[PDB]
C-alpha cells in the first residue's frame, strides 16, 4: 500500500437538472498525502448530461492543498439520467507514489415544462382519408416526440393511453395507489409487448402489487377505514369501498392480503349499510346522493365475498330515489341479484340505465366520479356479468367518442376507461387500411395498436382501403420546446418571488447560498375541494424542507410582509404537503370567496442558467379546472 497516493474528489451539483439547462459544476479534489501529487483529470459524460468546456490537463496539487475544477455542463433534452465521470490517474516518477480514483456521480433530468398529448379520432366511411393537422405537433420538440395510431373495426379504446397514464402518476395520495395497481393486476408481459408498452417482467410486475397492497394498508386508518393522505386523516367511505374492491379482486388472482386489514375494512363496509348517519362527507352538496354512492359500492364489494345482507340491500333500495347517477343503481342491481333478489336486482340495472349523472362538474358527490368515469364503469360491470347485451353496443359506441377527445383524464376515469377497454380488447371487428408509413397494406380481425416516430406523424395519412367502416384513434405524448402561453379554467395561480425581508426579489442576479420566499396564491371562481398546487423547481433552486404553515422558518425576527403571509398559509385548508428534491407540492381545498397563500423557502445553490417552470393547480378529479401561472424565462444563479 506504500505506492498509493488517496485523494479526495467531491463534485458540487444541483439535485436535479431540467432539459436544457447549463450548471457550473465544481471538482473539489484535496490532497492528504504528505508529498506533492501530479494528476491527470479525465471527464466524461454519459447520458442526458454533456460537457460544455474540454477535459483539463495536468493538476499540480501540494501537501494539504485543495483544488476547485470548473466544469460546465448542459442537461439534453428529455426524461431521464445523466451522469459524470472522473478518472484520476497520478502521473509519477519510477519511485514515487501514484493516484489511482474512479469515482460516478448521477443526477435526475426532467423537462421543466410538462407532457402536451395530442387526441385524434375518427371513423371513415370505405374510401375515406384522415390526415393529421400541420398545426398539431408546432410545439414539441421532435427527441420526445412519440405517438400510437389504434385501427379498428368497430369503435374502440386506447388501453395504451391509460395504462400510460397511470404509470406516469407521480403522487401517492391512497385513490392514485389503487387506480394505479389495476393495470399491474390484470395485464401481463406478451399483452403489454402486442400494445408495444415497454413494461417489467411478470415476475417484477407481481412483485409491484405485493409492495403496492402494502402502501395501501398505510393508508388504513385504526377504525378500518381508508384516509386519502395520511392514516391520522378522515374516513373516505367511497375511498374505502374503492380499496376493498381491490384488495378483494387481488386475492382472485393471487396475491395474499393480511385477513385482520379484509376483516377490518369489510366491517366498515357494513356499517355505511346499517348507518349511513355516522357518514360526514363535508364537501358534498347533496348528502342523500353522496352517501347513496358509497352505500352501492359498499353493497357490491360485500356482495362479491356472500357479506351483504338482503335486509340492508333492500333499504338502501327503498331510496333508490337518491341516487345521483346510474352507476350506484347499477352497483346494488348487481348486489341484490347476487344475494338472491334478482326481482329487485333487475329493476336496479333497468333504471341504472335511465339515469343519467347531472352534467354540472360543481356538484360535488365525493365519489371521484364523472359522466364519463361511471360510462366505463358500467359498461364493465354490464359485460362482467353479462347483463342487457343490446344496451352494451349503444354504451360502447358513447364511452368510445366521448373519451378519446379529452386533454385531461384523472386517474379515477383513466382506470375506469383501462377496465372498459380490458373488456373489449379482443372484439371481433374486420379492418383493411392503406397508411403513410407503410407500402403494405394494413389489416386486422380486432383492434391493432402500432407505435410511430416523430417522423411517422409529421406526414401522417391513413386511407379506409375496405368494404366496411373503418376507426381511428391516434394519441400523441410529447414535452413542447418552450413553456406554452399561462392558461386558467376556474382555477387561478400566481408566483411572486420575494427576499427573507418582504420585498420583490428579481430571479436574475442571483448569488450562490441566497436565500428566496416563494409566495404561491391561488383563486377559484368555483369551490375546488381536490386542488393539487405542483410547484416545479427551476433547478439551481434547492428546497428548504420546512412546512412554513407550522411556522418553521429560518427566521421569524422579520414580520410585518412576511408576518401576515404565513397567517394566511394557517388559514389555509392543507390537506398534503411535498417538499421533493425537483418540486413543492401541496394538496388544498379551495373556496370562491377564500383565496390560498402558500410559501415555502429556497436557496439558490449550483451557479448556472435554469430554465423556470410555471406555477400550476389543478383538480385532481375535475382536471378541466387549472392554471398555469406566468413565469420569468430564466434564473441565473452566479458563484
Ligand atoms: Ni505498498
Ligand atoms: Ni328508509
Not at 14 to 37: E, V, W, Y
Not at 92 to 109: F, S
Not at 115 to 138: F, K
Request: net charge negative.
Amino acid at each position: 500500500g506504500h505506492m498509493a497516493a488517496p485523494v479526495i474528489a467531491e463534485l458540487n451539483m444541483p439535485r436535479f437538472m431540467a432539459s436544457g439547462d447549463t450548471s457550473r459544476l465544481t471538482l473539489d479534489i484535496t490532497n492528504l498525502t504528505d508529498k506533492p501529487q501530479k494528476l491527470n483529470v479525465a471527464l466524461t459524460a454519459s447520458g442526458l448530461l454533456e460537457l460544455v468546456s474540454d477535459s483539463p490537463a495536468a493538476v499540480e496539487l501540494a501537501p494539504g492543498v485543495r483544488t476547485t475544477l470548473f466544469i460546465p455542463v448542459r442537461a439534453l433534452p428529455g426524461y431521464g439520467d445523466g451522469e459524470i465521470q472522473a478518472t484520476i490517474s497520478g502521473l509519477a516518477l519510477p519511485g514515487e507514489t501514484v493516484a489511482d480514483q474512479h469515482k460516478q456521480w448521477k443526477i435526475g433530468v426532467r423537462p421543466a415544462f410538462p407532457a402536451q398529448t395530442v387526441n385524434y379520432g375518427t371513423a371513415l366511411q370505405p374510401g375515406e382519408t384522415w390526415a393529421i393537422p400541420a398545426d398539431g405537433l408546432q410545439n414539441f420538440s421532435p427527441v420526445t416526440l412519440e405517438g400510437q395510431l389504434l385501427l379498428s373495426g368497430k369503435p374502440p379504446l386506447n388501453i395504451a393511453r391509460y395504462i400510460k397514464e397511470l404509470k406516469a402518476y407521480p403522487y401517492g395520495c391512497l385513490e392514485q395507489t389503487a387506480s394505479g395497481l389495476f393495470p399491474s393486476l390484470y395485464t401481463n408481459a406478451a399483452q403489454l409487448q402486442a400494445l408495444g408498452i415497454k413494461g417489467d417482467s411478470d415476475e417484477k410486475r407481481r412483485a409491484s402489487v405485493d409492495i403496492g397492497i402494502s402502501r395501501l394498508l398505510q393508508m388504513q386508518r385504526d377504525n378500518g377505514g381508508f384516509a386519502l393522505w395520511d392514516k391520522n386523516g378522515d374516513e373516505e367511505y367511497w375511498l374505502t369501498a374503492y380499496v376493498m374492491d381491490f384488495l378483494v379482486r387481488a386475492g382472485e388472482q393471487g396475491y395474499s392480503v393480511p385477513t385482520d386489514a379484509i376483516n377490518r375494512g369489510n366491517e366498515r363496509l357494513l356499517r355505511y349499510l346499517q348507518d349511513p348517519g355516522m357518514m360526514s362527507i363535508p364537501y358534498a352538496d347533496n348528502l342523500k346522493a353522496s352517501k347513496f354512492a358509497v352505500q352501492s359500492y359498499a353493497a357490491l364489494v360485500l356482495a362479491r365475498q356472500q357479506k351483504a345482507p338482503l335486509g340492508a340491500l333492500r333499504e338502501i333500495w327503498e331510496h333508490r330515489a337518491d341516487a345521483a347517477s346510474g352507476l350506484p343503481l347499477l352497483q346494488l342491481g348487481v348486489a341484490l341479484k347476487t344475494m338472491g333478489d334478482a326481482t329487485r336486482g333487475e329493476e336496479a340495472i333497468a333504471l341504472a340505465l335511465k339515469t343519467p349523472r347531472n352534467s354540472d362538474e360543481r356538484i360535488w358527490l365525493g365519489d371521484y366520479g364523472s359522466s364519463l368515469r361511471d360510462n366505463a364503469l358500467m359498461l364493465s360491470l354490464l359485460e362482467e356479468n353479462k347483463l342487457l347485451p343490446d344496451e352494451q353496443y349503444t354504451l360502447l359506441n358513447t364511452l368510445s367518442q366521448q373519451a378519446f377527445g379529452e386533454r385531461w383524464l384523472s386517474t379515477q376515469e383513466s382506470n375506469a376507461l383501462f377496465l372498459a377497454a380490458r373488456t373489449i380488447q379482443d372484439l371481433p371487428g374486420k379492418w383493411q387500411a392503406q397508411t403513410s408509413f407503410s407500402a403494405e397494406q394494413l389489416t386486422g380481425e380486432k383492434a391493432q395498436n402500432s407505435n410511430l416516430n416523430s417522423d411517422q406523424l409529421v406526414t401522417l395519412q391513413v386511407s379506409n382501403s375496405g368494404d366496411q367502416p373503418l376507426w381511428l384513434r391516434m394519441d400523441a405524448s410529447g414535452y413542447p420546446q418552450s413553456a406554452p402561453l399561462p392558461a386558467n379554467n376556474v382555477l387561478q395561480i400566481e408566483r411572486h418571488i420575494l427576499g427573507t425581508d418582504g420585498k420583490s426579489k428579481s430571479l436574475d442576479s442571483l448569488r450562490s447560498g441566497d436565500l428566496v420566499l416563494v409566495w404561491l396564491q391561488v383563486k377559484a371562481s368555483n369551490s375546488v375541494p381536490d386542488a393539487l398546487v405542483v410547484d416545479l423547481l427551476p433547478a439551481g433552486l434547492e428546497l428548504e424542507n420546512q412546512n412554513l404553515a407550522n411556522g418553521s422558518a429560518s427566521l421569524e425576527q422579520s414580520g410585518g410582509e412576511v408576518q401576515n403571509l404565513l397567517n394566511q398559509m394557517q388559514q389555509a385548508s392543507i390537506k398534503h404537503i411535498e417538499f421533493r428534491d425537483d418540486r413543492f407540492v401541496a394538496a388544498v381545498a379551495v373556496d370562491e370567496y377564500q383565496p390560498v397563500t402558500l410559501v415555502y423557502l429556497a436557496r439558490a445553490v449550483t451557479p448556472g442558467t435554469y430554465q423556470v417552470p410555471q406555477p400550476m393547480v389543478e383538480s385532481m378529479y375535475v382536471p378541466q379546472w387549472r392554471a398555469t401561472g406566468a413565469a420569468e424565462d430564466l434564473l441565473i444563479v452566479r458563484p
